[PDB]
Amino acid sequence: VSTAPYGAWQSPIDAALVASRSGRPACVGAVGDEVWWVAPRPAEAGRATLVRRRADGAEESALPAPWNVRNRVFEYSGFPWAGVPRPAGGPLLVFTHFGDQRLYAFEPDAPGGAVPRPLTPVSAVGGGLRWADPVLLPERGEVWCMAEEFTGEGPSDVRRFLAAVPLDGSAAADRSAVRELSDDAHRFVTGPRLSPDGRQAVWLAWDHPRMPWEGTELKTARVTEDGRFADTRTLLGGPEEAIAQAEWAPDGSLIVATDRTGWWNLHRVDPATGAATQLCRREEEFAGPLWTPGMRWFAPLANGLIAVVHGKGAAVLGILDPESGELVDAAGPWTEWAATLTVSGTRAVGVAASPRTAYEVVELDTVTGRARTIGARHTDPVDPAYYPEPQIRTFTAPDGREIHAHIYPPHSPDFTGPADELPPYVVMAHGGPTSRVPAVLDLDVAYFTSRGIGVADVNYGGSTGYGRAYRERLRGRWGVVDVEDCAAVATALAEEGTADRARLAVRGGAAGGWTAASSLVSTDVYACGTVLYPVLDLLGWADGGTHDFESRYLDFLIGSFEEFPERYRDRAPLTRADRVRVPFLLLQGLEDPVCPPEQCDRFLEAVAGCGVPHAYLSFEGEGHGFRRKETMVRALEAELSLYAQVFGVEVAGVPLLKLGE
């Protein structure tokens, strides 16, 4: 061990390794005795593939490039696949290919191998046709899902409804062959969930200007014999009751996760009256913000037990006995479980990680209570001694309010900083903003901490996982609460003498980019900042400047335009772009439909000539969020260079970012 300036420590973690290991298993699901999930392939044009895990442990990608398992529903991608086991011929699977947004069917065990065949027609009108959250029904020879069909060229010129697509491929070039199960009365809907007897269907629905976490309605209908929906009606829910998920238990009962008590809790629901009964009252979240159709937090098991990812703050998979109210969590090293879940037999399978291990596919068996890794087993790319040791802390702001944050101090088995120096710190603001960041191994974080630069990940007011009230703290306060909370943690760290007050950076992407930009504009706490595909122009954004799903999200964030039109200009970073007095880095994807690159251009034009050192790197072929390995490498090394230059530290492992005024 030797002494070296903070930020200049030699680290075995390069941006290429970081990119290579980015992402996590997602959308897990059981198919007979098999377990499938979506996995990222950053080095394969940033595509996502399907992974098939056989009972005997065999684990391999089921689709080769260029197949890309992802869709553009809500622009964030709804559950992209489905699969059913069959008596002969192997399982039948369907998935949405990102390239043409079509739903495809394929049989992995067919002689010759997987040969995807299209099931849906395309459209040149606006955003065309999109599909997601499917359920295979081979008895009816169809796959049921929710669909998006653009009717105009505007981002909101679209209708959504539940649909039935023929598995025989007769609708591949015939839109009339697609059956509309529900009508298009509701702008936003999720895929259908069929009762075990196949006579009743449910689905979530909502409209502008509400976000699903504000409120949703659980719709229901009788499924006729010929496969149509009848007597559609609202079973429960409303503009202020957030129903995040609904599932049929194998015994025919209905279970939903609602926040009517102030926290998302599981409730049994009378399929006829809609009356709900508490199954486990707790000041813990048993669900989360429904950003895409198909998210699952709980899963009913055939034996009557219920698997549930729950917790206040950190979420962990546990097993609930709705009869005794008893809840037993998984053990093992995993401290955070993602919002994806499936069951098979007495087993519940989810995706979880720890501060020392990347997300793995983990199985919890109800008979033994044993939890074990069954997929994507984590191997250390470098000695785990290079990973930071997270400190889950709650800071107390001026008015006594609690601010939840994850502190990652510089950490390295080979270096220590100068006695008379304190380490610079990078303060991060997650996206959303209605979501939360878990405290697990993240090479993007270790990339900095292993070099001598601390990191502080703040779950500012408005973050999820701490009840409706905490999520509501941000209503009408975007640009103030997120900014102040992040700054509170920063300055508190400096005052405590654990961070260099003069070397604090702020960074974030999407909503987090807005927070970072806003911080550089409305405060002088930071020495520099990194902004990724942010929202900087509110007026532009509100004026048909973003996808349909978030086209009215500002009503929640800053207030309606009808009531607070003045905020749309005052809160906008673009309006005060001239107030940025420190160097910054802007990163953007050129195919971004959520935060169009125009946002950046306008900002850059507003700061030109102000003599503020800065840089802007846009990437062709990248949408909202970077998926290609080469893109991530360049984005991360650029951010590090910015910090090296501003913090007066040397880093030769990355190219020197060219900053200009």
Side-chain angles (χ1 to χ4, degrees):
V1 181
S2 62
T3 301
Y6 288 106
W9 306 349
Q10 168 56 40
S11 172
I13 303 175
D14 56 50
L17 171 61
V18 175
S20 170
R21 300 300 202 87
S22 67
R24 63 163 172 78
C27 304
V28 75
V31 179
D33 63 8
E34 300 175 30
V35 180
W36 295 62
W37 65 83
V38 185
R41 286 291 183 276
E44 284 173 43
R47 82 185 183 102
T49 188
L50 274 173
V51 172
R52 180 192 198 180
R53 194 264 185 190
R54 308 305 293 280
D56 71 330
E59 194 185 330
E60 311 283 352
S61 171
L63 294 173
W67 294 115
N68 194 353
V69 185
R70 217 226 311 176
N71 58 71
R72 292 181 63 178
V73 169
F74 289 17
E75 288 308 334
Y76 286 111
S77 188
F79 208 96
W81 71 279
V84 296
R86 300 181 302 181
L92 176 61
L93 279 101
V94 299
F95 73 94
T96 56
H97 175 52
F98 189 77
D100 53 24
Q101 294 298 304
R102 309 177 77 185
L103 188 62
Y104 285 81
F106 81 93
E107 290 164 273
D109 298 327
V115 175
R117 39 180 193 280
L119 305 178
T120 60
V122 299
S123 161
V125 175
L129 291 165
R130 288 86 169 283
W131 322 78
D133 202 10
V135 179
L136 283 163
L137 301 179
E139 350 72 61
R140 286 183 175 291
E142 308 179 317
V143 55
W144 291 9
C145 61
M146 57 74 68
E148 298 190 321
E149 174 168 49
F150 280 78
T151 60
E153 307 302 318
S156 288
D157 290 332
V158 60
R159 63 191 293 259
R160 298 193 185 70
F161 56 89
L162 277 59
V165 172
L167 291 172
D168 65 3
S170 52
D174 180 8
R175 171 70 179 73
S176 73
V178 172
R179 307 194 298 105
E180 290 184 21
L181 303 173
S182 73
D183 58 39
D184 62 10
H186 291 290
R187 173 169 294 280
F188 304 109
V189 293
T190 59
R193 290 295 176 273
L194 285 293
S195 60
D197 62 27
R199 299 197 297 285
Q200 195 173 342
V202 297
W203 68 96
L204 301 171
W206 67 93
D207 308 78
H208 287 316
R210 300 295 187 176
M211 293 310 294
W213 45 85
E214 292 186 63
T216 59
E217 282 177 336
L218 181 65
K219 308 295 298 190
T220 190
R222 175 174 69 79
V223 181
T224 73
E225 179 181 304
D226 63 2
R228 293 170 298 89
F229 281 21
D231 311 326
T232 295
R233 63 198 168 86
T234 295
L235 190 53
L236 66 154
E240 300 184 299
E241 192 188 339
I243 309 186
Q245 186 190 347
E247 298 278 352
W248 289 99
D251 67 8
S253 58
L254 186 64
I255 305 175
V256 309
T258 168
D259 71 347
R260 63 172 54 181
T261 67
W263 294 81
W264 274 302
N265 279 182
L266 301 192
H267 289 63
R268 177 146 50 215
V269 176
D270 183 297
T273 74
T277 300
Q278 307 179 84
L279 296 174
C280 185
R281 192 191 183 81
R282 280 195 182 181
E283 304 187 309
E284 298 185 329
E285 297 288 32
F286 280 68
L290 187 63
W291 286 86
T292 59
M295 292 179 78
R296 298 187 77 198
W297 288 271
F298 71 90
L301 286 92
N303 67 15
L305 296 179
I306 302 171
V308 296
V309 169
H310 69 100
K312 172 183 179 183
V316 176
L317 172 63
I319 302 295
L320 170 70
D321 180 344
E323 206 73 10
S324 65
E326 173 194 63
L327 208 184
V328 177
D329 286 356
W334 313 284
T335 57
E336 300 257 18
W337 291 64
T340 182
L341 193 65
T342 190
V343 300
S344 178
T346 55
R347 306 164 294 292
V349 177
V351 178
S354 81
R356 277 152 275 89
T357 57
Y359 284 98
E360 303 175 295
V361 178
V362 186
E363 178 201 82
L364 176 53
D365 196 307
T366 61
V367 57
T368 64
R370 175 188 183 198
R372 72 186 179 114
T373 297
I374 63 167
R377 183 181 297 288
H378 169 83
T379 66
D380 286 320
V382 301
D383 184 300
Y386 293 91
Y387 305 154
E389 303 179 358
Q391 298 182 185
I392 312 304
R393 281 200 248 169
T394 289
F395 294 71
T396 290
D399 63 352
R401 73 175 178 289
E402 301 182 358
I403 300 178
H404 310 303
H406 303 323
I407 306 304
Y408 302 94
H411 190 283
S412 174
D414 312 321
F415 304 86
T416 64
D420 294 303
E421 294 299 304
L422 283 183
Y425 257 76
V426 177
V427 182
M428 314 186 163
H430 63 68
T434 304
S435 74
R436 81 177 274 281
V437 59
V440 301
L441 176 64
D442 185 324
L443 296 177
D444 283 287
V445 172
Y447 185 72
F448 293 111
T449 66
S450 63
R451 290 180 164 62
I453 295 172
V455 173
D457 220 341
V458 187
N459 277 314
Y460 50 83
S463 293
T464 52
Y466 298 85
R468 190 179 174 87
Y470 196 96
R471 190 169 73 251
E472 289 286 306
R473 283 190 191 174
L474 201 52
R475 180 184 290 286
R477 313 295 295 149
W478 204 38
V480 181
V481 173
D482 50 309
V483 170
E484 305 182 324
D485 282 4
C486 282
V489 173
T491 61
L493 287 173
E495 187 60 61
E496 296 170 350
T498 51
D500 188 333
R501 182 71 187 69
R503 296 192 293 174
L504 297 171
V506 63
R507 68 96 77 179
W514 144 282
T515 294
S518 298
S519 293
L520 297 184
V521 163
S522 61
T523 78
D524 230 295
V525 173
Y526 312 90
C528 59
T530 303
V531 188
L532 298 88
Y533 35 82
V535 174
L536 303 173
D537 183 1
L538 294 177
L539 287 167
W541 218 60
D543 186 37
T546 191
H547 64 144
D548 191 40
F549 181 61
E550 297 181 85
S551 62
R552 292 300 293 282
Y553 193 6
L554 285 175
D555 279 57
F556 166 88
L557 298 168
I558 61 182
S560 73
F561 180 74
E562 181 194 70
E563 181 167 45
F564 304 93
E566 0 78 20
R567 289 179 187 174
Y568 285 68
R569 179 154 284 167
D570 299 327
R571 299 279 183 87
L574 175 66
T575 302
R576 305 181 188 303
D578 54 46
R579 303 185 178 186
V580 182
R581 295 130 192 173
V582 294
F584 65 91
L585 172 64
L586 250 186
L587 296 171
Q588 175 72 43
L590 293 175
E591 333 302 350
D592 192 335
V594 183
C595 294
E598 55 184 55
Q599 290 281 309
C600 291
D601 302 328
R602 302 196 191 89
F603 194 80
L604 298 168
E605 306 176 315
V607 301
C610 286
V612 52
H614 64 276
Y616 174 55
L617 297 179
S618 67
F619 303 91
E620 220 185 305
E622 287 286 7
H624 189 60
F626 308 147
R627 296 185 175 72
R628 296 170 195 283
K629 177 176 181 179
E630 64 270 23
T631 303
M632 302 181 286
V633 172
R634 190 171 182 208
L636 187 57
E637 302 194 319
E639 170 173 16
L640 178 54
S641 174
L642 170 69
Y643 298 159
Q645 297 178 64
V646 179
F647 296 151
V649 60
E650 212 74 63
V651 297
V654 303
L656 203 171
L657 180 70
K658 186 174 175 58
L659 297 173
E661 314 182 311

XYZ file of all heavy atoms in Angstrom, residues 202-237:
297
model
N -58.630 -9.444 -16.033
C -58.411 -8.164 -15.381
C -57.214 -7.484 -16.033
O -56.408 -8.129 -16.706
C -58.138 -8.312 -13.853
C -59.352 -8.920 -13.154
C -56.907 -9.154 -13.619
N -57.120 -6.172 -15.854
C -56.012 -5.397 -16.386
C -56.069 -4.005 -15.785
O -57.121 -3.565 -15.319
C -56.061 -5.345 -17.924
C -57.203 -4.571 -18.531
C -57.177 -3.273 -18.953
C -58.513 -5.068 -18.842
N -58.389 -2.930 -19.515
C -59.226 -4.014 -19.459
C -59.153 -6.303 -18.658
C -60.550 -4.158 -19.898
C -60.472 -6.445 -19.093
C -61.154 -5.375 -19.707
N -54.934 -3.320 -15.763
C -54.880 -1.978 -15.200
C -55.103 -0.943 -16.293
O -54.763 -1.174 -17.453
C -53.529 -1.764 -14.513
C -53.268 -2.777 -13.388
C -51.833 -2.666 -12.888
C -54.259 -2.526 -12.255
N -55.683 0.195 -15.922
C -55.958 1.256 -16.886
C -55.952 2.633 -16.232
O -56.340 2.788 -15.072
C -57.308 1.005 -17.564
N -55.495 3.631 -16.979
C -55.458 4.999 -16.484
C -55.318 5.973 -17.648
O -55.099 5.563 -18.790
C -54.320 5.176 -15.465
C -52.928 5.060 -16.016
C -52.132 6.082 -16.457
C -52.154 3.860 -16.158
N -50.911 5.594 -16.859
C -50.897 4.233 -16.689
C -52.400 2.506 -15.887
C -49.887 3.301 -16.954
C -51.393 1.577 -16.151
C -50.153 1.982 -16.679
N -55.469 7.263 -17.365
C -55.377 8.272 -18.409
C -54.645 9.513 -17.943
O -54.309 9.643 -16.768
C -56.776 8.686 -18.867
C -57.636 7.509 -19.245
O -58.160 6.830 -18.332
O -57.784 7.257 -20.461
N -54.399 10.424 -18.881
C -53.753 11.685 -18.556
C -54.755 12.415 -17.663
O -55.960 12.191 -17.775
C -53.514 12.517 -19.819
C -52.409 12.005 -20.687
N -51.202 11.577 -20.180
C -52.306 11.911 -22.035
C -50.401 11.242 -21.177
N -51.046 11.436 -22.313
N -54.274 13.299 -16.771
C -52.861 13.639 -16.561
C -52.227 12.846 -15.412
O -51.276 13.305 -14.783
C -52.925 15.129 -16.258
C -54.160 15.206 -15.393
C -55.151 14.280 -16.101
N -52.746 11.650 -15.148
C -52.231 10.831 -14.055
C -51.143 9.834 -14.429
O -51.138 9.284 -15.530
C -53.372 10.042 -13.408
C -54.480 10.873 -12.810
C -53.984 11.688 -11.638
N -55.085 12.368 -10.965
C -54.957 13.096 -9.859
N -53.764 13.246 -9.289
N -56.027 13.670 -9.319
N -50.215 9.616 -13.501
C -49.171 8.616 -13.688
C -49.743 7.429 -12.897
O -50.477 7.625 -11.925
C -47.834 9.077 -13.091
C -47.197 10.273 -13.806
S -47.056 10.119 -15.622
C -45.862 8.762 -15.788
N -49.435 6.187 -13.305
C -49.981 5.040 -12.571
C -49.735 5.020 -11.056
O -50.548 4.484 -10.300
C -49.373 3.839 -13.303
C -48.094 4.400 -13.892
C -48.530 5.749 -14.383
N -48.633 5.606 -10.605
C -48.357 5.628 -9.177
C -49.197 6.683 -8.455
O -49.156 6.794 -7.227
C -46.855 5.816 -8.911
C -46.196 6.875 -9.727
C -46.150 8.214 -9.456
C -45.482 6.688 -10.956
N -45.450 8.869 -10.440
C -45.029 7.958 -11.374
C -45.181 5.569 -11.745
C -44.287 8.143 -12.550
C -44.443 5.751 -12.916
C -44.006 7.029 -13.306
N -49.962 7.463 -9.216
C -50.857 8.445 -8.605
C -52.146 7.659 -8.395
O -52.694 7.617 -7.296
C -51.117 9.639 -9.530
C -49.903 10.524 -9.763
C -50.231 11.774 -10.573
O -51.026 12.603 -10.086
O -49.695 11.921 -11.696
N -52.607 7.012 -9.460
C -53.812 6.209 -9.371
C -54.094 5.418 -10.638
O -53.736 5.841 -11.741
N -54.719 4.255 -10.482
C -55.091 3.416 -11.621
C -56.394 2.724 -11.263
O -56.809 2.718 -10.104
C -54.069 2.285 -11.912
O -53.951 1.448 -10.756
C -52.700 2.846 -12.288
N -57.033 2.137 -12.265
C -58.264 1.399 -12.055
C -58.040 -0.032 -12.531
O -57.395 -0.260 -13.562
C -59.411 2.025 -12.851
C -59.996 3.270 -12.219
C -61.086 3.904 -13.067
O -61.104 3.687 -14.298
O -61.922 4.633 -12.493
N -58.549 -0.995 -11.775
C -58.423 -2.387 -12.174
C -59.690 -2.681 -12.953
O -60.791 -2.635 -12.399
C -58.340 -3.317 -10.958
C -58.185 -4.802 -11.323
C -56.849 -5.019 -12.022
C -58.265 -5.667 -10.082
N -59.536 -2.951 -14.243
C -60.667 -3.253 -15.103
C -60.896 -4.758 -15.110
O -59.977 -5.539 -14.852
C -60.383 -2.784 -16.533
C -59.937 -1.336 -16.649
C -61.030 -0.368 -16.222
C -62.261 -0.496 -17.112
N -63.238 0.599 -16.872
N -62.123 -5.170 -15.401
C -62.428 -6.588 -15.464
C -63.500 -6.833 -16.511
O -64.228 -5.917 -16.897
C -62.917 -7.131 -14.105
O -62.984 -8.561 -14.165
C -64.299 -6.582 -13.769
N -63.582 -8.072 -16.977
C -64.576 -8.446 -17.968
C -64.754 -9.957 -18.011
O -63.859 -10.719 -17.643
C -64.170 -7.929 -19.341
N -65.929 -10.385 -18.453
C -66.230 -11.801 -18.573
C -65.675 -12.248 -19.921
O -65.889 -11.584 -20.934
C -67.749 -12.019 -18.526
C -68.201 -13.458 -18.758
C -69.706 -13.603 -18.545
N -70.504 -12.929 -19.570
C -70.736 -13.427 -20.781
N -70.234 -14.606 -21.124
N -71.471 -12.747 -21.652
N -64.945 -13.356 -19.932
C -64.384 -13.861 -21.176
C -65.356 -14.868 -21.756
O -65.521 -15.959 -21.215
C -63.031 -14.558 -20.950
C -62.475 -15.035 -22.284
C -62.060 -13.606 -20.269
N -66.002 -14.501 -22.857
C -66.971 -15.394 -23.477
C -66.292 -16.646 -24.004
O -65.069 -16.771 -23.959
C -67.729 -14.706 -24.637
O -66.858 -14.566 -25.765
C -68.225 -13.330 -24.203
N -67.097 -17.574 -24.504
C -66.583 -18.824 -25.031
C -65.796 -18.626 -26.317
O -64.803 -19.311 -26.544
C -67.735 -19.790 -25.276
C -67.311 -21.125 -25.842
C -68.494 -22.034 -26.095
O -69.258 -22.290 -25.143
O -68.660 -22.492 -27.246
N -66.234 -17.695 -27.159
C -65.535 -17.456 -28.415
C -64.368 -16.482 -28.269
O -63.846 -15.969 -29.258
C -66.509 -16.971 -29.497
C -67.148 -15.638 -29.162
O -66.812 -15.054 -28.110
O -67.990 -15.169 -29.961
N -63.967 -16.221 -27.027
C -62.828 -15.353 -26.782
C -63.005 -13.849 -26.785
O -62.050 -13.121 -27.049
N -64.203 -13.368 -26.487
C -64.430 -11.931 -26.460
C -64.627 -11.451 -25.030
O -64.854 -12.254 -24.124
C -65.639 -11.575 -27.325
C -65.399 -11.832 -28.813
C -66.670 -11.717 -29.645
N -67.671 -12.703 -29.247
C -68.591 -12.508 -28.306
N -68.652 -11.350 -27.658
N -69.445 -13.477 -27.999
N -64.509 -10.143 -24.826
C -64.678 -9.547 -23.507
C -66.079 -8.958 -23.415
O -66.522 -8.248 -24.319
C -63.645 -8.435 -23.281
C -62.267 -8.930 -22.897
C -61.868 -10.236 -23.172
C -61.358 -8.069 -22.288
C -60.583 -10.676 -22.845
C -60.071 -8.497 -21.960
C -59.682 -9.805 -22.239
N -66.779 -9.252 -22.327
C -68.129 -8.728 -22.145
C -68.293 -8.116 -20.761
O -67.597 -8.488 -19.817
C -69.158 -9.841 -22.350
N -69.205 -7.159 -20.657
C -69.491 -6.521 -19.381
C -68.259 -5.860 -18.757
O -68.071 -5.909 -17.540
C -70.060 -7.570 -18.419
C -71.192 -8.387 -19.040
O -71.956 -7.827 -19.859
O -71.319 -9.590 -18.703
N -67.414 -5.248 -19.582
C -66.228 -4.587 -19.055
C -66.686 -3.585 -18.009
O -67.712 -2.928 -18.177
C -65.455 -3.838 -20.149
O -64.945 -4.776 -21.103
C -64.301 -3.067 -19.544
N -65.925 -3.469 -16.930
C -66.284 -2.553 -15.860
C -65.090 -2.343 -14.950
O -64.136 -3.117 -14.978
C -67.446 -3.136 -15.047
C -67.098 -4.448 -14.347
C -68.339 -5.226 -13.921
N -68.006 -6.595 -13.523
C -67.619 -6.954 -12.302
N -67.520 -6.045 -11.339
N -67.316 -8.223 -12.047
N -65.145 -1.283 -14.152
C -64.085 -0.991 -13.207
C -64.395 -1.807 -11.961
O -65.475 -1.675 -11.385
C -64.061 0.502 -12.850
O -63.723 1.257 -14.019
C -63.036 0.783 -11.754
N -63.459 -2.666 -11.562
C -63.640 -3.503 -10.381
C -63.255 -2.709 -9.139
O -63.896 -2.822 -8.093
C -62.786 -4.764 -10.495
C -63.040 -5.861 -9.462
C -64.529 -6.227 -9.436
C -62.189 -7.074 -9.809
N -62.201 -1.909 -9.255
C -61.759 -1.069 -8.147
C -60.656 -0.122 -8.591
O -60.151 -0.225 -9.707
C -61.269 -1.913 -6.961
C -60.008 -2.774 -7.079
C -59.402 -2.954 -5.697
C -60.347 -4.122 -7.700
N -60.288 0.800 -7.713
C -59.247 1.749 -8.046
C -59.798 3.130 -8.354
O -61.013 3.339 -8.373
